[PDB]
Amino acid sequence: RRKVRLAQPYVGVFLKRDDSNESDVVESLDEIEHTGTFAQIHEMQDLGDKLRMIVMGHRRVHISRQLEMVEVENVVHEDFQVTEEVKALTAEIVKTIRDIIALNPLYRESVLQMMQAGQRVVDNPIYLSDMGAALTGAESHELQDVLEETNIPKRLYKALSLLKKEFELSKLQQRLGREVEEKIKQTHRKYLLQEQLKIIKKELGLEKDDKDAIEEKFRERLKELVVPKHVMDVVDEELSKLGLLDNHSSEFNVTRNYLD
Amino acid sequence: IIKKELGLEKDDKDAIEEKFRERLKELVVPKHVMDVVDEELSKLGLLDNHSSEFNVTRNYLD
Amino acid sequence: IIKKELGLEKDDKDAIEEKFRERLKELVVPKHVMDVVDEELSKLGLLDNHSSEFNVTRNYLD
Amino acid sequence: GAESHELQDVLEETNIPKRLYKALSLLKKEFELSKLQQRLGREVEEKIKQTHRKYLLQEQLK
Amino acid sequence: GAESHELQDVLEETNIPKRLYKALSLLKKEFELSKLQQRLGREVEEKIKQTHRKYLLQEQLK
Amino acid sequence: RRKVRLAQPYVGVFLKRDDSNESDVVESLDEIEHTGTFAQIHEMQDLGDKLRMIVMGHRRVH
Amino acid sequence: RRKVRLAQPYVGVFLKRDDSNESDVVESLDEIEHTGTFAQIHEMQDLGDKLRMIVMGHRRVH
Numbered sequence: 206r207r208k209v210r211l212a213q214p215y216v217g218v219f220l221k222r223d224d225s226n227e228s229d230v231v232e233s234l235d236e237i238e239h240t241g242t243f244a245q246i247h248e249m250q251d252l253g254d255k256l257r258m259i260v261m262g263h264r265r266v267h268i269s270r271q272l273e274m275v276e277v278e279n280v281v282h283e284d285f286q287v288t289e290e291v292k293a294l295t296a297e298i299v300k301t302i303r304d305i306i307a308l309n310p311l312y313r314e315s316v317l318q319m320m321q322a323g324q325r326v327v328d329n330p331i332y333l334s335d336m337g338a339a340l341t342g343a344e345s346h347e348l349q350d351v352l353e354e355t356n357i358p359k360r361l362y363k364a365l366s367l368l369k370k371e372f373e374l375s376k377l378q379q380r381l382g383r384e385v386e387e388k389i390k391q392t393h394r395k396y397l398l399q400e401q402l403k404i405i406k407k408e409l410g411l412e413k414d415d416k417d418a419i420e421e422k423f424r425e426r427l428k429e430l431v432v433p434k435h436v437m438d439v440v441d442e443e444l445s446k447l448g449l450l451d452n453h454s455s456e457f458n459v460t461r462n463y464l465d
Numbered sequence: 466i467i468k469k470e471l472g473l474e475k476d477d478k479d480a481i482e483e484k485f486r487e488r489l490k491e492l493v494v495p496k497h498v499m500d501v502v503d504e505e506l507s508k509l510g511l512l513d514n515h516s517s518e519f520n521v522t523r524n525y526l527d
Numbered sequence: 528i529i530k531k532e533l534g535l536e537k538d539d540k541d542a543i544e545e546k547f548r549e550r551l552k553e554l555v556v557p558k559h560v561m562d563v564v565d566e567e568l569s570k571l572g573l574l575d576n577h578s579s580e581f582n583v584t585r586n587y588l589d
Numbered sequence: 590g591a592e593s594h595e596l597q598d599v600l601e602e603t604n605i606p607k608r609l610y611k612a613l614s615l616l617k618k619e620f621e622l623s624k625l626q627q628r629l630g631r632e633v634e635e636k637i638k639q640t641h642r643k644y645l646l647q648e649q650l651k
Numbered sequence: 652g653a654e655s656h657e658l659q660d661v662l663e664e665t666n667i668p669k670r671l672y673k674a675l676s677l678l679k680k681e682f683e684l685s686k687l688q689q690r691l692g693r694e695v696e697e698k699i700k701q702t703h704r705k706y707l708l709q710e711q712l713k
Numbered sequence: 714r715r716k717v718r719l720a721q722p723y724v725g726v727f728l729k730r731d732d733s734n735e736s737d738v739v740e741s742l743d744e745i746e747h748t749g750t751f752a753q754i755h756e757m758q759d760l761g762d763k764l765r766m767i768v769m770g771h772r773r774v775h
Numbered sequence: 776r777r778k779v780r781l782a783q784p785y786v787g788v789f790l791k792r793d794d795s796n797e798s799d800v801v802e803s804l805d806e807i808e809h810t811g812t813f814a815q816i817h818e819m820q821d822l823g824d825k826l827r828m829i830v831m832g833h834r835r836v837h
Contacts (some may be wrong), residue, residue: 402470404633414507415511449576450577536650
């Protein structure tokens with residue numbers, strides 16, 4: 206609120222070091238890395254909570270001594286005069302990004318379609334490389350280590366290596382998952398074969414013992430008898446009830462005992 | 466085909482039943498109890514091992 | 528639409544309910560027993576086939 | 590898939606048309622079993638599909 | 652992946668042996684660059700692997 | 714489009730020099746390398762881009 | 776089939792007037808609107824019938 210009065214509001218974003226501790230930040234200012242991301246303030250929302258500020262990466266800075274604030278934009282972009290192969294790594298980088306997002310979708314593809322290498326609209330290739338590496342799931346420590354790099358080839362290689370590390374972890378997880386699913390399918394398919402055999406052999410073997418070994422056996426047992434109509438209809442009703450009921454129920458067992 | 470499929474399958478719960486069958490073997494089993502035991506064995510084979518009815522059936526057989 | 532290929536459910540049970548409805552048809556059923564039987568049939572419909580209370584209700588209906 | 594006995598019996602044939610006929614008949618012999626197995630498998634599969642579709646209709650009613 | 656200027660300079664050569672020598676030298680240099688990058692990457696991967704296997708076990712834990 | 718009516722459709726593929734510049738291509742013509750490769754067009758596809766032409770080198774020339 | 780041998784394949788398009796009549800198209804040439812639209816034939820398919828012209832508006836004329 207103190208900076209709203211200012212004509213050009215601004216906000217700075219930094220990165221904490223390992224072993225985060227809220228009390229340490231206020232107690233000592235040395236917890237934050239010398240690297241910082243100075244950027245402008247867009248707008249406050251405060252929908253759920255009272256602090257939902259928007260931050261963006263516009264101007265990187267490396268304070269000489271945070272304790273002692275002097276600053277300068279020593280944004281070094283050393284590059285080779287001959288530019289005929291330098292972008293060759295960019296093609297493989299975009300191909301790797303495409304492979305990662307296809308195999309490991311994380312965000313919408315519309316951003317990639319809007320920014321295409323062939324369009325030539327990319328006036329800041331370094332920022333594009335940073336955005337591409339942003340999709341990397343590496344820890345903030347890896348990001349800080351990459352930032353420590355000053356040579357363009359070294360930083361590009363480290364971003365590519367982090368992409369490859371994420372690729373390796375993701376593909377290992379996917380391979381494990383698909384192997385587990387295929388094991389499930391094999392185990393269930395052998396059981397389906399067993400059920401097919403059971404259906405085929407129920408008549409051949411057990412003669413439908415689940416219900417029929419009782420039904421037909423008692424039918425034949427009564428066949429030799431000159432069965433009165435009363436007990437005949439009673440037996441028919443009892444057999445219908447037995448067929449309706451499941452084989453492993455107490456009511457079914459009592460019905461079977463009465464029928465016997 | 467039936468016998469080839471039978472030979473292609475290696476799983477069964479028979480051994481426990483055969484235990485009681487051999488227990489009966491040495492005994493000079495009267496026919497009445499033999500047929501009653503066969504009927505109850507068929508029921509046991511029909512029933513799942515974990516059902517309480519199966520437990521009562523197993524106790525009766527023992 | 529409730530009736531979508533389902534039989535003997537959400538309607539008169541063929542085994543018992545509908546079976547005894549035709550039995551009641553010929554009789555000159557008094558209103559008292561009419562309502563008592565209607566309530567009993569509703570309870571039978573609300574009860575599962577294999578329950579003891581269902582069996583008692585069916586026997587009373589018989 | 591003809592057994593080695595069938596292969597030896599075919600080899601015993603001397604006339605070219607006879608051996609060609611026997612080879613075609615062995616192919617038909619294996620094809621009959623393959624067709625029977627395929628038809629039985631798809632029949633059981635469709636039976637399972639219908640048994641599950643009726644349950645799906647019941648679930649839709651619920 | 653040599654530079655397009657390298658391709659044009661190879662095209663400049665007229666005699667077959669000279670262009671063959673230039674192509675072989677270009678292949679040698681490109682393979683040496685790839686070999687250097689691969690060796691540096693192997694060293695970096697080894698250094699990253701110095702991270703204790705406890706870290707991978709804790710990754711699985713998390 | 715203008716070469717569809719032409720009896721023999723063809724195309725010449727070239728290579729530029731360093732410092733690529735779209736404006737200089739139309740402003741000056743010496744940027745394109747003297748060496749070229751004439752070939753016969755195969756077919757237009759234009760899946761999503763209005764120009765997706767297929768280029769193959771057949772007849773080299775300087 | 777007569778324009779396949781023509782050195783310059785092109786197909787025209789016009790518009791009709793009110794009270795369309797198929798017989799009047801061949802009996803009189805004045806039924807068609809004077810405006811015309813010449814264009815180039817793209818491809819012949821003849822999937823369902825023997826005539827599946829693909830036409831476009833390329834060169835208008837009066």
